[PDB]
Amino acid sequence: MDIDPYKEFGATVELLSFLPSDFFPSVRDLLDTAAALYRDALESPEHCSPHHTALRQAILCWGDLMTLATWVGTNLEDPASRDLVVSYVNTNVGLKFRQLLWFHISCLTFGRETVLEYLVSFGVWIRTPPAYRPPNAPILST
Amino acid sequence: MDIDPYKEFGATVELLSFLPSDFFPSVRDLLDTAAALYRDALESPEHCSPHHTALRQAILCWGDLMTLATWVGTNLEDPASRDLVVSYVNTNVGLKFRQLLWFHISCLTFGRETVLEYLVSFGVWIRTPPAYRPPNAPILSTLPET
Amino acid sequence: MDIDPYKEFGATVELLSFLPSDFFPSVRDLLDTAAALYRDALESPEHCSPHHTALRQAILCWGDLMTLATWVGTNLEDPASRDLVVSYVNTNVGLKFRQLLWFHISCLTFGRETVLEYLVSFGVWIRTPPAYRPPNAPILSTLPE
Amino acid sequence: MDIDPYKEFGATVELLSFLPSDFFPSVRDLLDTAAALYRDALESPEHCSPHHTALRQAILCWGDLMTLATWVGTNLEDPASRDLVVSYVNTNVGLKFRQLLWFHISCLTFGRETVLEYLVSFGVWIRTPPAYRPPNAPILST
Amino acid sequence: MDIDPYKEFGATVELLSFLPSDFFPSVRDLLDTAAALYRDALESPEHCSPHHTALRQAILCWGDLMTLATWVGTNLEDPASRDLVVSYVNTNVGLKFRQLLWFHISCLTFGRETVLEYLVSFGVWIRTPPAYRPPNAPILST
Amino acid sequence: MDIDPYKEFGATVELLSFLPSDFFPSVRDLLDTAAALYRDALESPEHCSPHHTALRQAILCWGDLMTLATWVGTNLEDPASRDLVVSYVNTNVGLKFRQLLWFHISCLTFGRETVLEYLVSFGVWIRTPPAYRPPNAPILSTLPETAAAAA
Amino acid sequence: MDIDPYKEFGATVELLSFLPSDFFPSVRDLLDTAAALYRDALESPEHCSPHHTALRQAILCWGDLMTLATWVGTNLEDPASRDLVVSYVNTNVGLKFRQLLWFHISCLTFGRETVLEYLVSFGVWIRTPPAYRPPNAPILST
Amino acid sequence: MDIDPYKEFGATVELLSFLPSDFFPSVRDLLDTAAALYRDALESPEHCSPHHTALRQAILCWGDLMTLATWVGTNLEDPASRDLVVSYVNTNVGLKFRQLLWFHISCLTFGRETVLEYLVSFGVWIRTPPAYRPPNAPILSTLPET
Amino acid sequence: MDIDPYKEFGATVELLSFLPSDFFPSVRDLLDTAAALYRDALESPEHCSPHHTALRQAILCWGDLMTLATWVGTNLEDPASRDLVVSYVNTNVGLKFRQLLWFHISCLTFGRETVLEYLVSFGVWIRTPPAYRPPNAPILST
Amino acid sequence: MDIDPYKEFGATVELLSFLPSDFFPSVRDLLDTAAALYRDALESPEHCSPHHTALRQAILCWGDLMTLATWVGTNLEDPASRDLVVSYVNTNVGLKFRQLLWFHISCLTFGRETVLEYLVSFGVWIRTPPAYRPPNAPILST
Amino acid sequence: MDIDPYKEFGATVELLSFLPSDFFPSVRDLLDTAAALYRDALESPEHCSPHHTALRQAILCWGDLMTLATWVGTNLEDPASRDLVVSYVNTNVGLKFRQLLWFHISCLTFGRETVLEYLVSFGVWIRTPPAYRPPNAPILST
Amino acid sequence: MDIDPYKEFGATVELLSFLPSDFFPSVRDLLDTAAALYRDALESPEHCSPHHTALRQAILCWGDLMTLATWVGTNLEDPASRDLVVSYVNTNVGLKFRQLLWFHISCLTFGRETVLEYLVSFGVWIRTPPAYRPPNAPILST
């Protein structure tokens, strides 16, 4: 099964894989900034743009998953199951939601083409050895 | 925060909350029908309508959840914990995902207006107690069948 | 006084008398649908129709009643008295508010004339003895079937 | 000296008796419906239709019978005669008043064109064995 | 209900109470002339006015009470209950039916205006003491 | 004598022979509906249609047969003769009277052509074995317009 | 009820009762003459006159009665009961069929007006005392 | 001498084999419905259409077989052979005459195209397994009491 | 039922009965001619003329007779009954099939009117005495 | 589901609560005024403005509370809870009912915007100390 | 290489997976129907539709497989090998060939769009629960 | 029942019977070239020519046969069945599918009429004995 939501937006999973793991901000920060900056748009009952529709469903799923995590932590009996599962819910799938939400927020704030250019720039910058590339990573901003 | 995902489409969780279980086909069946019918449309790099994007996001979420469930099943040793968590996932979250997918298919195949009208009619029908409620449930389907 | 809110809409308490008690559904099933179907209209500052104004007044009155019920549950110690009072207010006047909400909601959604037609049809249906009446009791539905 | 009040209308006593007794609902239901629907028309000083007048004298006649029943129940001593009279009044002429009130009210609400076709196809549908007639009884409805 | 059927015809019982009882004719003799004048008209399916319908319905109720009388005479033995019932029927219902029939027959035969004027004149006549009221009671006629 | 009373209107004895027993209403029910429906037409002195005169003659015949049944019931002593005769008269030709009266009534009310169409509808549907006969039979009285359907 | 099949054709049972019994010759001869003269017209699928269709049902009824008579004759054991039943078929109800057959055949073959004239002539002829009446009874002829 | 009588109407003997045997109605009932549906037409001296003449000759040879059967039943001696021959003629030849008669009656009364439609509909219906086929088998009926 | 195939073609069984037996050729001698002359026409799916359809039905019923005969000959055990039945079927109804085939084949080949003329001529010729009939028999030929 | 009904008329509860309590005349005065001045207006089946509908709903709640108080007084036993809940209902929601009733009555009788101006003016004035303000509280009047 | 014959018709093999097996009729019935309906068309030398050619190769390789089955069953000595092979080829390959034949035949008879509509409707029907679906399984007919 | 696909294409097995065995190339030698030349054409949803569909279904049937044979041979332990079945399938019907593939490919690539001429010339060439047959076997090419 090969399904790619970024395909409609012009990007692809492997292209997004150029960016390495675990440098993203915490998903909680992403939610906080989106609320502080996109509170009105999300609450609107009209499809203001394609990105809002996906982000809404992603946020709902993230909330339900966090509720599942807290409920299992509060109700399961043994310590091994509880710590293993609560650590698991924030291990790999959390990275998935984190990267998806980062992509949607960045594209909404700047634009898909700018995000693709930043992706390619980061890929070229990271591919080279550290001994030659500059010590400042590319920064997404206007 | 507080967001109603169905609100963009005009419906609400409370409106669908009238819908009881046993009028939603199983999630696996929704996957089967969606993959069989709308595969070319879904895989397209053009967003033809918000329904497709929402459906795709739900499909990804459900697939990830099933991956989580099988991963837990492979490793957990305590039968009670693993069976309890898998049942929880299949009954609580499964209900929500199944409701959403059914709503998306119904809206896409039958149209927005028809689905909302049928939902209001069903809500009116379900509230009346059995003593005065007609026994023939309203059913809308693509079949010219009586 | 002898004042009937239904009297100026064309309906009447005696006319609504056809529907027997226990027919109307739970109040919460009225509140949830009213909210999730006319939230903006109720919250809007425009009195489009008297139905909305009556529904707003009923909402406030019922909320006040429930606040009083929670108060008496929270403060008083006499258990039998509090149970009797909450039961009385929840069952007796609750029925009146419930039918009020049902009437206005149906009139708004389907039309007052259709509501009156449905009332007379239900009266005809219910008066007939069980031995001859069909099981298909009349029901309004913007949907065909 | 042969008088049938239905004679001025299209119906006839034997034709209206075509339907089986016990199908007409209790008299209290008829009176309550008639009140709730036509209090103003009955109280009006105008004769908008002969049906209203016929119903008016029907109501007065029934009230006289009810007063007779109340008086006989109040004064007389023999329980045998009392129960005999009350049962006879409640059952025998009760049927006639029920039929009369039902006819007038139904004709007014739905018109003669529907009542004189509801007295046919019903009482006819009853005769047919429950194996070739339509599954359910017909109902003057809306 | 609170129905005064006379109010439809313009009069009311309060006004009609001017005529004191014992100045009305016997029911049998009144029915005699009513029939002799409008037999076919009552029996016809044509309804020229509410008077005919009311007369028909009143005749029907009178026949019902006669049926009750013959039933009770045929069944019961004791004389007290029987003759008390007969007295009640001839007293309460008798006066009301007799005045109703007289009013309707008179207004149909001569008109509503003449009969109303007659009631007014009879009232003003009967108010005055006998010492001054003329000894020829007013009579509606040709 | 080769006489076909139905052949005047097109039908035949052996065509209506299709209609199954325990289908027609009892004769008394037919009398109650016919008198209650066409009282004046039957009582009228005008040959408005052959159906009316046919029904009138059948009514007279049935009245005479009932008079005979009452006579045999109230007079004869032998119980065996009594019950044999009454059962015979009630079952054998009373069924024929039921048949004729119902057919005439349906023709007059529903129209003659429709009656023949419904007759052939049974003639086909009833002829099928139960393994292929649907359990939903061709109803004729469209009068009630279904009065709504069941399930 | 009282229904007269001769009512439609202009005659009435009251008038037709003038003719005394033994006047109508016999069922067998009526059937024979009907076969000899008008047999074919019965089978035509067009009703040329109301007499033909009524004659059809009269013949069917008489055949049914003959079958009933012979069948009951073959099965009953008590000779007295069977003999009495056979006596009944030609006594009461056979006379009715003979009367109907005579009326219809005469009306068809000579004509209705001539039939009525013959009835009236026989009525005037019979009443007169035998000592003065002529011995040549009226008979319809061509 | 390889002749298929149904061939010129557009039907075929093997195509007609779709309808299972024992479904076709009794010979006597088809005979007496044909009688009091087409007495005049069969009796007429005009060859209106091949339907009527084919029916004429079919019923003729069927009556000839019936006469032979009764003659042998009356005349021959041993019961076993007589009964065996009667059953043979009534079951085997009776079936073919029955199907011939049914096809002609149905096509004449309702038309050939209607008969073809009914045949193909019944084929698609019967091929369906019982667990999935509905119990509402098709029946041609100019009566629209559907 | 009284059904005669010859009636539609204008002939009758009584007419063909005029031709004596022993002249009509064996059924096989006609089947061979029909095959060898009109195999293509018979096998065609076209209802060219009623003659062809009638011949087809005749051939089918004949073949069913033949199948029955061979079946009984092979299966039945009693030689006497077998011989009796085969002789009966072969001789009695064989004459009828011979008449049918001869009539249809001749009418198709030369024309129905010509065939009828041939039948009448042959009948009158055979009826004629030898002293006066022409010295040669009448034979049908091209 | 928090609602401020005055928002659709234009005002807000906080604007109304800006004014002090115990200023409006007792509830009975308002009820007597409303009755005596608008009996026919409220009893009429015409809804002139939302004022009347709101007033009628207020009267319905007021009657419900009165019947509840009578019930609790007659049925419950302990005086302490009785009087306590009586005082609670009379002070807490009684104030709101009185405020709403007075507002609607005054706005109906004298005007909406003028009543709003009176409210704001008196609210600002009462907070104003006795410095540059007349020693007579503003009084609303025609 | 990946080949999907339905993709030439616009459908897909996976799409056909809705209809659960135990629905596709036995191969023999499909072959009998195809022959009975299109004998001459299949034997024809003209390509009147692609469906005809496709069904032609379907029948051809089906016949080759049947020859394989009969050959291996007749020739081999070991029972397990032969019966296992025949059973497997009858069940697994039989399913695919049967569904291919049914699709071709139905599409040719009714039309491609009608077959697609029937397939999708049946799928939807069987997916849903009972109380939410009509009780009549869809069935295509012309 | 029996179909010759080549008749639809104008040829016959008898015509191709001229081509001897062990003359067609290997199955792979045709399949690989057919793929390399018409992969996009076959994969397209458009049926440009019947040859393409026939080739597609031939490849499907052959691939299913090969898959089944390989799977069963991998399962079964007996060597006789495995080797004999492999040889049989690769020999007889393998040759048949090979010849069909070659025919369709040649007709597609050089043109059907050219194929017919080449086969005719090949037959004429091969008939003659080798003593006079030239050593340059006719070959179809550009």
Residue numbers in the entry:
A (entry chain A), D (entry chain I), E (entry chain J), G (entry chain G), I (entry chain E), J (entry chain K), ...: 1 to 142
B (entry chain B), H (entry chain F): 1 to 146
C (entry chain L): 1 to 145
F (entry chain H): 1 to 151
From the paper:
The HBV core (or capsid) protein (Cp) is 183 residues-long with an all-helix N-terminal assembly domain (residues 1–149) and the C-terminal nucleic acid-binding domain (residues 150–183). DNA-containing and empty HBV capsids are trafficked to the nucleus by a complex of importins α and β (Impα and Impβ) to deposit the viral genome or core protein.
To examine structural changes of the Impβ-capsid heterocomplex, focused reconstruction of the quasi-6-fold regions (also referred to as hexamers) of the capsid was implemented. To perform focused reconstruction, we used the particle coordinates of the I2 density map from the high Impβ sample since these complexes were geometrically defined and biochemically had the best chances of having their quasi-6-fold sites occupied. The six “symmetric” classes were pooled together to produce a 4.0 Å hexamer map. A hexamer model was flexibly fit into the final density map. We found that quaternary structure changed at both interdimer contacts and at intradimer contacts. In contrast, the focused Impβ-bound hexamer reconstruction has a pore diameter of 9.75 Å, expanded more than 1.5σ beyond the simulation mean of 7.60 Å (orange). In the focused hexamer, the CTD density of 1 B monomer allowed the model to be extended by five alanines beyond Thr146, the last residue with a defined side chain. With the C terminus extended to residue 151, the B CTD was long enough to exit the capsid.
